[PDB]
Structure 1
Amino acid sequence: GTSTIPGFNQIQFEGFYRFIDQGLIEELSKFPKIEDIDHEIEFQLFVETYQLVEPLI
């Protein structure tokens, strides 16, 4: 955009890249750890190993 007309879809393209590249972590890290009334069983998510799989179709 400094010496040409930018691609008309660039705003959508950069925005979606930011969502995948940084947006997923900021929300997946706000997921609270789930503990029961008796605190016996605790569920948690290991966010560092999040993955995205290419569409099958």
Structure 2
Amino acid sequence: NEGISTIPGFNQIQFEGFCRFIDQGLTEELYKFPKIEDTDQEIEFQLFVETYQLVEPL
């Protein structure tokens, strides 16, 4: 949609890479985390992957 009629941005590569990262790579990595269960009672902690939210820098 862009760069086909004009010279694209020189820094668009890093921009789109960081955007794709924040969009999908974080969720993809959080999905593959295992369920921590190391005990006889098997006390299990879990991370709700759906509730993934980044916060603005302080």
TM-score, normalized by the shorter chain, greater than 0.5: yes
Give deviations 1:1-57, integer Å, cap 9, x for gaps. 10100000000000000000111100000100010131431011101001100001x
Q: Number of residues paired by the alignment?
A: 56
Unaligned runs of 5+ in 2: none
Instruction: Return 16-25 or 31-40, whichever deviates more.
Output: 31-40
Aligned equivalent of 1:31: 33
Moved over 2 A (4+): none
> With structure 2 as the length reference, what TM-score do the two structures score?
0.90
Equivalence map 1:11-50=2 (5 Å): 11-50=13-52
Q: Which structure features the higher share of helix residues?
A: 1
**Percent same amino acid among aligned pairs?**
89
| Structure 1, unaligned runs of 5 or more | none
CA RMSD of aligned residues (A): 0.9
